[PDB]
């Protein structure tokens, strides 16, 4: 029924921006709401409501998917991806750590090339080493790939929700 999605990653990577792009299709250069909600549409039907939880017992409870976000211009954000994945599994008490879904987002892909520091290859290798986690490279700013990425986040959440 309701899909709970958590977004983790270092501060400054674009977690809040990606949520706003997904939820409201906007971006500019929310206090008091623990989550924002967006109706998921698949094949032109409304199938479910997604809660997107941006950055605790009630915090982890009920999570259906976990999204991990680095910034392709910040090397340290990328090196911390496995830490965030691990921090989640160690605290969230999920029914089946073996099968719980993560999705990795490499954000700010709109940046000039000279400012990119993390290569696509390195990210594909890490996503693989972590259990073949889906990898998307994204731009909240320019609306690049966030639709396709959340399409897979929603699909992962739906599968976990109904398991
Ligand atoms: C409009 C002026 C500007 O910020 N220019 C730089 C564009 C670089 N490209 C870019 N920047 C992004 C993207 N998403 C988010 N941002 C920027 O990152 C910081 C922090 O974002 P936030 O969403 O607050 O991160 P956390 O919640 O993870 O802390 C902000 O400057 C935001 O504008 C993106 O796709 N591309
Ligand atoms: Mg934020």
Contacts of 135 (CB under 8 A, 6+ apart): 104, 106, 123, 124, 127
Reference 86, options 70, 66, 62, 58; nearest CA is 66
Q: For residues 11 and 94, what is the distance between their CA atoms, to the nearest angstrom?
A: 24
30/16 Cα distance (integer angstroms):
9
Nearest ligand for residue 110 CA: 1
Resolution in A: 2.0
Structural domains for the chain: 1-163 (3.40.50.300)
113/99 Cα distance (integer angstroms): 36
Answer yes or no: is the C-beta of 107 below 6 A from any ligand 1 atom: yes
Q: How far is Cα 16 from Cα 8, in angstroms, rounded to an integer?
A: 10
Q: Whose CA is nearest to atom 3 of ligand 1?
A: 29
What is the biggest distance separating any 2 CA atoms in the chain, rounded to whole angstroms?
Answer: 44
Handedness of CA 8, 86, 98, 104 (dihedral sign): positive
Tally of residues, the chain: 163
Which mutation among 113, 141, 143, 145 tests ligand 1's pocket best, with the greatest number of atoms within 8 A of CB?
A: 141
Q: Which two tokens stand for residue 12?
A: 């400054």
């Amino acid at each position: 029924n309701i899909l709970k999605v958590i977004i983790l990653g270092d501060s400054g990577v674009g977690k809040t921006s990606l949520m706003h792009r997904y939820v409201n299709d906007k971006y500019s250069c929310t206090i008091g709401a623990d989550f924002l909600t967006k109706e998921v549409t698949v094949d032109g039907d409304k199938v479910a409501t997604m809660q997107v939880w941006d950055t605790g017992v009630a915090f982890y409870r009920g999570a259906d998917c976990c999204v991990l976000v680095y910034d392709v211009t910040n090397a340290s954000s990328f090196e911390n991806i496995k830490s965030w994945r691990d921090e989640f599994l160690v605290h969230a008490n999920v029914n089946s750590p073996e099968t719980f879904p993560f999705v990795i987002l490499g954000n700010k892909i709109d940046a000039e090339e000279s400012k990119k520091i993390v290569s696509e290859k390195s990210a594909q290798e890490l996503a693989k080493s972590l259990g073949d986690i889906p990898l998307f490279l994204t731009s909240a700013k320019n609306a690049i790939n966030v639709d396709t990425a959340f399409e897979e986040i929603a699909r992962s959440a739906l599968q976990q929700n109904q398991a």
